[PDB]
């Protein structure tokens, strides 16, 4: 039961990292586009 609970919590932690990476990809793409345009 502690193992299932750990996997559940780790999945939430994984989702947070996936969402964070998506945010950062969009932010650096916005910067690269700005610099290209300038």
Partner 1 sequence: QIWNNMTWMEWDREXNNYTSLIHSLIEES
* Paired tokens of 28: 């650096």
What is the chain's percent helix, strand, coil content, to nearest 5?
95, 0, 5
Minimum CB–partner distance for residue 37 and partner 1 (Å): 17
Residues 10, 15: Cα–Cα separation, whole Å: 9
Q: Residues 1 to 38: which contact a copy of itself by CB under 8 A?
A: 3-4, 6-7, 10-11, 13-14, 16-18, 20-21, 23-25, 27-28, 31-32, 34-35
Vertex 19 angle, CA 15 and 25, to 5°: 145
Minimum CB–partner distance for residue 5 and partner 1 (Å): 5
Residues at the contact surface with a copy of itself, assessed by CB under 8 A:
3-4, 6-7, 10-11, 13-14, 16-18, 20-21, 23-25, 27-28, 31-32, 34-35
């Amino acid at each position: 039961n502690n193992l299932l609970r750990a996997i559940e919590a780790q999945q939430h932690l994984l989702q947070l990292t996936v969402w964070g990476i998506k945010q950062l990809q969009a932010r650096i793409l916005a910067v690269e586009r700005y610099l290209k345009d300038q």
